[PDB]
Each structure stands twice: as C-alpha cells, then as structure tokens.
C-alpha cells in the first residue's frame, strides 16, 4: 500500500457568531472526511459512504455520547487559556490526533493543540512530556505530565489503535483510498513554460522542470494540488524562458510509482 | 469479548497471591484493577496500559499487550486483603468490560 | 467530601412496584454510570450519563430509565419492578468519559429484592 493516515481535528471557538457552532470534530483517511460532528447537530455523522455502510448504529450512538462528553471538556479547557492569557473577545482552540501507515511498515503518531490557529502544545510519545510554548501551555504540561497514566495510555493509543482504526478503515473504503487514476499532463506557454496535470488520484504528485539535465528549484514556480470536484486532483508547475538563449527544457511527473518525462521542443 | 480471571483463591497471611486476568476485547485502552471488600463499594487499585510491571506499595500490576493477560500481585498477604478483586478493561469504544471478580480468601 | 452518595441502601419491592435510586456526587464529575452486580458475573452497565445534559443505553436497559437531573445527580428508575430486577445495584462517576485512564469511583450500594 502507499502511505495512508487516520487524523481527527477539534475547533472551539470562546464567542461564536449568530450561527457558527462552539464545538466542531471532523476526522480524514488521507484527504477524505470520514466522520463529523458538531455543536448543533450534537450527532456524530459519516462524511464518507464506505464508513455508513460498515458501521453499525452501535458506533455512532457511542462516539455520539463520547463527542457531547469531549465537546464540554473542550469548553472548559478554553475557557481555561482564555482566562490565563487574559484575553477578551473570541478565540479558537483546537486539537489533531492521529497517525500514519508508511509504506515500508514503520508507523507515526501524533498529538497536538493549538490556540489562536498556533501551536501550543505538542505531545512527544518516546520522551513522554509535552512541549509548551508558553507559560500558559507551561501550566497546562504540568497538569498533564503530573497524570502520568493518561500520557501512557495516550501513547498506546497512537501506537496501537489508531493503527488499527486506520487499517480498518483502509479496508472499508480500500475502492477510493486504494485506486489510481493517472495524471494527464499537457505544456503550454503562457513568457514561462506551464506544465499542467489534471484528473488524477492519489493527490500527492511530484512536478519539477529540467533545464538541459539540471534541476532549478529556486527557479520553478510550484503550484498546489488542488481538488477538481471529481475525486481528482489537478496541479501545475511553471518555469521562465530565457530569451536570450535555447535551453531544453523537460517538465517532470512523478506519480504513484511511474515517471513522466515531456521534452519541450 | 470476554475478560477471565479465577472465581476464588486461598493463600497464607504473609505469603504472596497472583490473581491473573486475561481479556479478548475489540481493541485496548487500558486495563483496570479495583478491590471490593464484602458488602462495600469497589475501590480503584490500578491501571496499566502500555506492557510491564507497576508497583504501589505491596500491589503490583503487571500488563502484556500482546498477550492479553494481566495480574494483580499481592505480597505479604494481611487478614485485611480479603475481598474480591475486579479486572476491567476499556475497548476500542471505551466500554468498561468487568470480569466477574477473583474473591480472596486469606488463612491466618 | 462525600463523595458518592447513594440511596437507599437497602429496598424491599412487590412486582409491579415503582422505585427510584438516588445518587449525587460532590466531586465535580462530569460523568455518571448505573451499574448491576449479579452474583457469578461482572458488573453490567444499565445507563450512564457521559456528560451533564446527555444520557444513554448501557448494556441492560430493559426496564430501566435514568435522570441526570444536573451536574450532581443522576437518579435511576424502575417503573414496574420484576424479580429479575433483585440485585445489588452501583453508582459511580468519573471526571471525564472518553479518556483511557481515569478511574470510576463507586456509591456505597442499593440492595434491591422484588418479591411476587
């Protein structure tokens, strides 16, 4: 299999707008939303088809109870910060746990929070202790390396079910997360030589230019992948000609284990 | 799903006793003992969920993972360790599953 | 400091009969838990309370309902008693649900025997 990764994300936010909710969770198997969750639904819902057809109701009325219980402690944990900092206003708080099955077998795993849309704790699962940024995330590590029970059974937890978790959802949705659509890759000039990929999956894609065998980074215009509508993925990548001198210029594509070469005449 | 552990045990007063529970459970979040004196309210002993051996005064709880098997260790057994002792593990729901409780019969 | 506070100890009932179990805790718990203990088996789940202002199904709810009536209370009920309701019946309460390690803490009991 390629890499896969199982992630979860919460979003608290202290003074939300008329509509917006005060508690958000979403998870992903790589770049696709598998479940949801939120203050005003108050359920917790599948975001992809292949999870509501293999997950018994037992699932989501259980984690539906566990999200209401999470979404009061992310509360109290905000309102926690934002009294320490001492800040007024709205602010955000947010979490992402989750983990990765590499290719070779070697797995990671990870844990950590943020305030404001920055970082402000990270969870080392080797050491055991959580990084702070500040003294208000200084406060919080002391709290939570003093329970040291809850770092262990947060480390089983990357190591060993979100592994699991991930697996298990592979195989549900292996039709989607397994599949491969080629890229179809074009150039034209627009000066500077665009080399221009659409229609493929997985999303991750390398595109480079070569000038006369060479490399230049500093060089290359490198566009992001961007989601078509479809399931696939488009991108792009550009390079300036010089108009003082011919060069040969050659856009490169690496995707999902095969290389593609387009030599500019 | 199931947790085991042995419905009785009968040791001397100063020698050692391992009460041994062993779980089945879809997916592990940790692994609890409680003690519950006759009569009284179960009362938090342990917790392990990463592999080995914990000590808290003459308890010791050890975990393998792999194995899915705990024990509860008891030395220098006292007339006051009699009482029933509770295995518990979460699953990968978070559902305590109890086992039925090892009781512990002490001889002076 | 009470901790758990559970009532009554002990009940006699007649089939049919209406009970209610009280149980308050004053440690700040978020999460509160109905539990049966049943001679040859371990403690099953009736209801529990994940959160102030949530409740749902534990693995016996057949003849049970419950009320987390706020932060410190949650009440169990048995509308019609049967005999198979006699047993000794458990409240406990966590700080929080949804996390690995935190341990429950247990009222002192409620000894019910239903008689036709």
């Known amino acids: 299999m390629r890499t896969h990764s199982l992630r979860y994300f919460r979003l608290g936010v202290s003074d939300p707008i008329h509509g917006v909710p005060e508690f958000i969770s979403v998870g992903y198997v790589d770049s696709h939303p598998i479940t949801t969750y939120d203050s005003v639904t108050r359920q917790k819902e599948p975001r992809a088809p292949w999870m509501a057809e293999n997950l018994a109701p037992d699932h989501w009325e259980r984690y539906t109870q566990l999200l209401r219980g999470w979404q009061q402690m992310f509360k109290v944990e905000l309102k926690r910060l934002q009294r320490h900092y001492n800040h007024s206003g709205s602010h955000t708080y947010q979490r992402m746990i989750g983990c990765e099955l590499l290719e070779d077998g070697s797995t990671t795993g990870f844990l950590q929070y943020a305030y404001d849309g920055q970082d402000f704790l990270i969870f080392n699962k080797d050491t055991l202790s959580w990084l702070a940024v500040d003294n208000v995330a200084h406060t919080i590590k002391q709290a939570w390396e003093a329970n040291q029970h809850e770092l262990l059974y947060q480390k089983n937890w990357l190591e060993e079910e979100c592994i699991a978790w991930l697996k298990r959802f592979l195989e549900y949705g292996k039709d989607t997360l397994q599949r491969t659509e080629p890229p179809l890759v074009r150039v034209n000039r627009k000066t500077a030589l665009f080399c221009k990929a659409h229609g493929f999956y997985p999303p991750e894609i390398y595109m480079t230019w070569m000038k006369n065998g060479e490399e230049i980074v500093q060089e290359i215009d490198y566009g992001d992948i961007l989601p078509s509508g479809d399931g696939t993925y488009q991108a792009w990548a550009s390079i300036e000609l010089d108009p003082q001198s011919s060069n040969l210029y050659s856009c490169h594509v690496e995707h999902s284990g095969v290389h593609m070469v387009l030599q500019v005449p | 799903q199931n947790i085991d552990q042995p419905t009785e045990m009968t040791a001397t007063e100063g020698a050692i006793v391992q009460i041994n529970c062993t779980y089945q459970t879809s997916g592990f979040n940790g692994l609890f003992w409680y003690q519950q004196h006759a009569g009284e309210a179960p009362t938090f002993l342990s917790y392990?969920?990463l592999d080995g051996l914990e000590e808290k005064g003459r308890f010791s709880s050890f975990l393998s993972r792999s194995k899915g098997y705990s024990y509860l260790l008891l030395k220098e057994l006292q007339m006051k360790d009699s009482a029933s002792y509770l295995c518990?593990?979460?699953?990968?729901?978070?559902?305590?599953?109890w086992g039925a409780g090892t009781k512990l019969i002490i001889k002076p | 400091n009470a901790g758990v506070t559970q009532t009554p100890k002990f009940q006699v009932l007649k089939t049919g009969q209406s009970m209610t179990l009280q149980c308050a805790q004053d440690?700040?718990?978020?999460?509160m838990y109905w539990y049966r203990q049943d001679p040859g088996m371990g403690l099953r789940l009736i209801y529990y309370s994940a959160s102030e202002g949530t409740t749902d199904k534990g693995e016996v709810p057949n003849g049970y309902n419950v009320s987390r009536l706020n932060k410190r209370e949650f009440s169990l009920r048995l509308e019609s008693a049967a005999p198979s309701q006699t047993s000794v019946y458990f409240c406990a309460s966590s700080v929080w649900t949804g996390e690995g390690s935190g341990e429950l803490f247990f009222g002192e009991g409620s000894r019910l025997t239903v008689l036709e």
């Open positions: 392990n969920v």
């Open positions: 518990a593990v979460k699953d990968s729901n978070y559902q305590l599953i």
């Open positions: 440690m700040n718990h978020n999460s």
